[PDB]
Amino acid sequence: MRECISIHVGQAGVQIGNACWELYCLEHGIQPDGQMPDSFNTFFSETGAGKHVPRAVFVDLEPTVIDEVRTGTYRQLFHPEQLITGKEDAANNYARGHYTIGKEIIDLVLDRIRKLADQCTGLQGFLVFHSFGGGTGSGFTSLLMERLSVDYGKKSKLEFSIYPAPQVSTAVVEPYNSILTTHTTLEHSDCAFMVDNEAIYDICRRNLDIERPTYTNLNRLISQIVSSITASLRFDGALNVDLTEFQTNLVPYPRIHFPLATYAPVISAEKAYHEQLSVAEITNACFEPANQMVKCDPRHGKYMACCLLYRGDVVPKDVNAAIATIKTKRSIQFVDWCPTGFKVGINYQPPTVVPVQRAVCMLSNTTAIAEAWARLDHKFDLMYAKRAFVHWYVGEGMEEGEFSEAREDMAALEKDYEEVGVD
Amino acid sequence: MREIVHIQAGQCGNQIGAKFWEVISDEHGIDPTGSYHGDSDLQLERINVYYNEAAGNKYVPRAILVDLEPGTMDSVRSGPFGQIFRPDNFVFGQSGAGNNWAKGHYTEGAELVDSVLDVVRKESESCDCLQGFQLTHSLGGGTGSGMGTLLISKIREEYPDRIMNTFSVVPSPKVSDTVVEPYNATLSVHQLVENTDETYCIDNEALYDICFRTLKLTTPTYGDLNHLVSATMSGVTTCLRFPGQLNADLRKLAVNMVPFPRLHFFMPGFAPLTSRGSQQYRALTVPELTQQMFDAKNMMAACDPRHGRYLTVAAVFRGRMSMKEVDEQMLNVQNKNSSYFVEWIPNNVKTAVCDIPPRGLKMSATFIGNSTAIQELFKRISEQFTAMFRRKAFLHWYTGEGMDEMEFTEAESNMNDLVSEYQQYQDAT
Amino acid sequence: MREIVHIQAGQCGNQIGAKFWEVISDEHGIDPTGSYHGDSDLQLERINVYYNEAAGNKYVPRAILVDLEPGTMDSVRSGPFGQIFRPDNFVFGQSGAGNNWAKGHYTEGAELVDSVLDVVRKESESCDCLQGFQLTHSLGGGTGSGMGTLLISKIREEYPDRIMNTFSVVPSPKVSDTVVEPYNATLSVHQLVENTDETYCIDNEALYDICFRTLKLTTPTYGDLNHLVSATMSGVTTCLRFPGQLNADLRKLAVNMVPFPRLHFFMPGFAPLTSRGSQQYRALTVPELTQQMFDAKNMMAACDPRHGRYLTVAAVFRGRMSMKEVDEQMLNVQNKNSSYFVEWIPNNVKTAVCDIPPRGLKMSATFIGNSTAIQELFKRISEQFTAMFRRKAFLHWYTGEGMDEMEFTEAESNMNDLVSEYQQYQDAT
Ligand SMILES: Nc1nc2c(ncn2[C@@H]2O[C@H](COP(=O)(O)CP(=O)(O)OP(=O)(O)O)[C@@H](O)[C@H]2O)c(=O)[nH]1
Ligand SMILES: Nc1nc2c(ncn2[C@@H]2O[C@H](COP(=O)(O)CP(=O)(O)OP(=O)(O)O)[C@@H](O)[C@H]2O)c(=O)[nH]1
Ligand SMILES: Nc1nc2c(ncn2[C@@H]2O[C@H](COP(=O)(O)OP(=O)(O)OP(=O)(O)O)[C@@H](O)[C@H]2O)c(=O)[nH]1
Numbered sequence A: 001m002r003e004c005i006s007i008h009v010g011q012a013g014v015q016i017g018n019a020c021w022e023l024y025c026l027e028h029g030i031q032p033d034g035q036m037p038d039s040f041n042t043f044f045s046e047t048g049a050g051k052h053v054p055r056a057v058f059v060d061l062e063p064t065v066i067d068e069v070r071t072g073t074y075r076q077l078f079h080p081e082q083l084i085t086g087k088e089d090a091a092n093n094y095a096r097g098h099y100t101i102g103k104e105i106i107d108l109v110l111d112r113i114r115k116l117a118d119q120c121t122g123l124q125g126f127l128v129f130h131s132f133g134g135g136t137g138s139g140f141t142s143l144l145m146e147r148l149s150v151d152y153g154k155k156s157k158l159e160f161s162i163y164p165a166p167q168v169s170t171a172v173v174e175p176y177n178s179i180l181t182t183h184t185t186l187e188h189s190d191c192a193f194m195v196d197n198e199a200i201y202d203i204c205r206r207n208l209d210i211e212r213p214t215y216t217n218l219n220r221l222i223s224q225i226v227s228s229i230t231a232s233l234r235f236d237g238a239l240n241v242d243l244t245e246f247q248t249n250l251v252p253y254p255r256i257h258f259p260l261a262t263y264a265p266v267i268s269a270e271k272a273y274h275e276q277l278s279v280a281e282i283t284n285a286c287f288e289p290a291n292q293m294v295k296c297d298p299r300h301g302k303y304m305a306c307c308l309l310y311r312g313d314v315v316p317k318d319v320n321a322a323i324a325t326i327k328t329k330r331s332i333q334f335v336d337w338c339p340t341g342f343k344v345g346i347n348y349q350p351p352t353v354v355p356v357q358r359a360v361c362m363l364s365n366t367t368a369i370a371e372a373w374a375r376l377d378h379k380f381d382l383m384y385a386k387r388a389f390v391h392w393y394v395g396e397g398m399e400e401g402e403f404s405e406a407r408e409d410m411a412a413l414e415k416d417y418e419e420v421g422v423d
Numbered sequence B, C: 001m002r003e004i005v006h007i008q009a010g011q012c013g014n015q016i017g018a019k020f021w022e023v024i025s026d027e028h029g030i031d032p033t034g035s036y037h038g039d040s041d042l043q044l045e046r047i048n049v050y051y052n053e054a055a056g057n058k059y060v061p062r063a064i065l066v067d068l069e070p071g072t073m074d075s076v077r078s079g080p081f082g083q084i085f086r087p088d089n090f091v092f093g094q095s096g097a098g099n100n101w102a103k104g105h106y107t108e109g110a111e112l113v114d115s116v117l118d119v120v121r122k123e124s125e126s127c128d129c130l131q132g133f134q135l136t137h138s139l140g141g142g143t144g145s146g147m148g149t150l151l152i153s154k155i156r157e158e159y160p161d162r163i164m165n166t167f168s169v170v171p172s173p174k175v176s177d178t179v180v181e182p183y184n185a186t187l188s189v190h191q192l193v194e195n196t197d198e199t200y201c202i203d204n205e206a207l208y209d210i211c212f213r214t215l216k217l218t219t220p221t222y223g224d225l226n227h228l229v230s231a232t233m234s235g236v237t238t239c240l241r242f243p244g245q246l247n248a249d250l251r252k253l254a255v256n257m258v259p260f261p262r263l264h265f266f267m268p269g270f271a272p273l274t275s276r277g278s279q280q281y282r283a284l285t286v287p288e289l290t291q292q293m294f295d296a297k298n299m300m301a302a303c304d305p306r307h308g309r310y311l312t313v314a315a316v317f318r319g320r321m322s323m324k325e326v327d328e329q330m331l332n333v334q335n336k337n338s339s340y341f342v343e344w345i346p347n348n349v350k351t352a353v354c355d356i357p358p359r360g361l362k363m364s365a366t367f368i369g370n371s372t373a374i375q376e377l378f379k380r381i382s383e384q385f386t387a388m389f390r391r392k393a394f395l396h397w398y399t400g401e402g403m404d405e406m407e408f409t410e411a412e413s414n415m416n417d418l419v420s421e422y423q424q425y426q427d428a429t
């Protein structure tokens, strides 16, 4: 009766969704053919025959990666009216994804939403797997979110996004993407989510015993996070926290909606022993700086709000002693005027494995993330100091002052976390 | 006669009633189906007060189950004692309150309230004589905060003489399971101080403590967390459902205790409590049941009676027992803790003796306490309110529902009006 | 009536009580479980004084077991007579006193003392009439030194009239099992001389001697070392628990013996003692039980009565016996050892005759002695104190706990105040 649809924008989001719906089919026992040999209306719908289809929309301006789903192993799962392709990519140009090509096939993707919104009645959240690296994953992202608040307005819109890395950075105009996309995702998204590529590597290198990771394995870490956020809807625990509450819990002021995800425990197969993984053991590893997936030191700021989504085998009194430890420390410290800073969620379902006992997803809306914007503002100034690459965005119809209008917009964003940090 | 209509709300309070009606099932020999299997004919003599005897050897729980999402209603009907209820009475919404008081009281509270108030009317018409209404919910969630408090103001508009008791859990002192637990307390404080006749107040942390201090448990489940309140609620009306050497009911407990209608916020107490094997190495008699009550640790609300002053004391016993073994114990303990009480009441110990024990041990006692210790918890809660209010955070949700600061401020002032009055009689002696 | 509450401490004193309550078990027909199996109805007539009769044919040892590490409590509960106790009364810490008096009296002594003083209060409230408190501990260890002595000063603040006796082992004369045995004696001397009504004092070496001289044993275990004190403690109150031709109890032994409250440090004596086969080749009668007491070797405190002067003499007999067979023996032996006594008391021999023997031999006698021989042991102990004090060694532990030299010096002076007073009446005649 309760639903939560998903949209995938750009090439980086599709390869996230290739591992996500790989995991969801293994959750409810679904085959790649939509077949299984109760309450799962959030991510699936039933046909007239005994087949289930995903509530997913795959958009791309280049026809490459969607053919990898249209010819891959997960081929028969998807409705061919969902698989939407373009012809010419934005090709790491935000003005092409926002003005040139994305304005043409915008009619088809938005029409597929209401075709999914017929059978949905408990519409409780949206999923937009979009990166800020590629132009298609960013230029279409701004055009998509404008119509939905015109469409729904009151319904929830969540973005499990990918943060551009401060050191290991692939493309060139990746600093140009973030400042331009700021005005959309601060005025439409109810709670955006930042994940950096860079912190994943040492988790793969040290904690997962494989120094040289693959992008197939980078998606496996985030796909476990997205499932355990939905662990209250898809199942039944003693304390089920639905997605309406998170945007009401984690948001003290309606502009501040940038937490970070933290999955724990992250172990290897050989290190599955030499440990016991009690509920007090693993939550201290959550607040370890080298276990999070965002390159931000949590002891460089203060926590505004914290959330903990447990699964597996959990007794709350045993967690009650675990939370009592973290308030009674000193290197871990909160925003002082928020003394009630925990949101606990327990599900009695084990964390499934993709080819352990319990697992924790930590969601901490903190002030440690605010330094990451300043590391990216420093990138954007010098490339705009030369007026470099202006003839591509202006070459694809964009105002020069539209950079400058969004330039001060980050300063009003940055002064928020500075103001909340002091008493 | 004098039948009682049961209303639930929230998500915590439903699972308590999911255990509480199991307690009433074996306190009346009621099977999980709905038929009867008891042998003692004292059950059938007053069976009507918590059960409608339906047609054809049936008994249904006179209870109104209310939620705002179909999950918890599914969990009750699938597990134990779910088919015993009437499927007509599973009256529940589809949205979920979102852990917002204003969603449970203004927007989504107005929807399902009409479906409930006919069911309240259908039971109150069907009852021969009506005694009072009881409510089990939360003060931390959304559905337990707004939806239950919206009902009681409509019921006080209906019935002036009928009593009302809420077994509402106090928001937690130190652990913070709810992020907005002041915003679910303070907006719920104002409804409770106006038109609730007596109000039960249970801290979370002491319930963890009593399950750990006396019993010494390792993995306490909610089937054993919330079970202590289920025996507690049964001990309130256990003199109603069976005869005694000194009977009692919900009106006798009200007028004896509450000295002024703004001071009616009570604390429980239960005895005896043992371990699984450490149960025989103790003289489990009346003086052991005497001194097990009056200590600070037995209170399910975490408060020190040493840091406060009592006003009145009720005590409900169960099982056959003598009297001077009780009465001198119920007299002398006022003299050893002499300065802890207040001056202006002679013999503030109300005694109640039923003649039926629990299904189990031979004798049992239920303590109902009233003291000035609870107001010191609210000064923390008023601090927890103002800490999230001196920056005026979390307002745009309630602004999105529509509410001025004065409704927050006067309820905080009315919370301070509770502060100004439990301190007033405490300062007096 | 006149029930007695039992407190233990230390590590030696617990194993003594681990044997002593086995003695009281077969002196009342008490099984290892807690039920009753005796046949003589004189046991049940006064069973209450060392046992609470719990609910349902039960009997529990009215005893308070206290340690500071979970090892010795585990050894009691796993071995014999461990399930007979109440699991509520195993009240013990987790650190261990570290063989420091100041850890047992200042830092870690303040922690567990609140858990004990309710259990003392819970037993003293439950007792109909209270007689006095008894303590079995060490004077050499840490837990027996500080923790037991911290309790008794709090008890003298409670009860002025209740008697108090400590069966405290004297630190050893020649063998040095404890490195800091003056620092566990002298700081424990000051507590015993203030507010202990009578005080039992047993040397270690004579207990090795009596187990080797009379019995001629080869491998003496603590089950036979500490067993002699267990029969000794039972002979103190054996006229209380059963009728006699001349009864006695703990108050009759106090006021008869102690001539001035600073002189109350006593010595025991037990008879008869044989070998396994050398047990019939002796006329085990009253004159053999007469002369077995008064020699130097029977004293469990290693002291020579020839090198000292008595003040008073108590004697408690067990089993049926005549009187002129006793009385002339209890009169003539004062005249053969005439100069060894003191002048200013006529007939200093207190006689006590119960009418119940031990479970075993036909007649038995318990000697309670008081002499000036014990002060000569303290001059060794004051020398042992000053030998480790004239260099001022081992101070940084007590400095780390916090203590001036004057607390060491005045207690050494108060030890010398014991020297100045047992010598005073010895110099007098
Ligand atoms: N003693 C218990 N406390 C509980 C239990 N479940 C939740 N809680 C507490 O109750 C509070 C949450 O309230 P609810 O369980 O009633 C959530 P509710 O349906 O009222 O509203 P929503 O937030 O819209 O779901 C919070 O303080 C929890 O710590 C339980 O089974 N026992
Ligand atoms: N006659 C006996 N003397 C004993 C026995 N065990 C120890 N002792 C003596 O007692 C002294 C040691 O004291 P304890 O056994 O009570 C050690 P305690 O728990 O009091 O403190 P800690 O040093 O902190 O462990 C020392 O003089 C030993 O020689 C025993 O079973 N019998
Ligand atoms: N999360 C995630 N990010 C990836 C992966 N592979 C590449 N990326 C990042 O995704 C960004 C590139 O975005 P894309 O989605 O591939 O490109 P696009 O949005 O389709 O736009 P164009 O290819 O320029 O037309 C860069 O920052 C890459 O580091 C992956 O497997 N997972």
Ligand SMILES: [Mg+2]
Residues within 6 Å of the ligand: A010, A011, A012, A134, A136
């Ligand atoms: Mg691409």
Ligand SMILES: [Mg+2]
Residues within 6 Å of the ligand: B010, B011, B012, B141, B142, B143
């Ligand atoms: Mg709920």
Ligand SMILES: [Mg+2]
Residues within 6 Å of the ligand: C010, C011, C012, C141, C142, C143
């Ligand atoms: Mg020891």
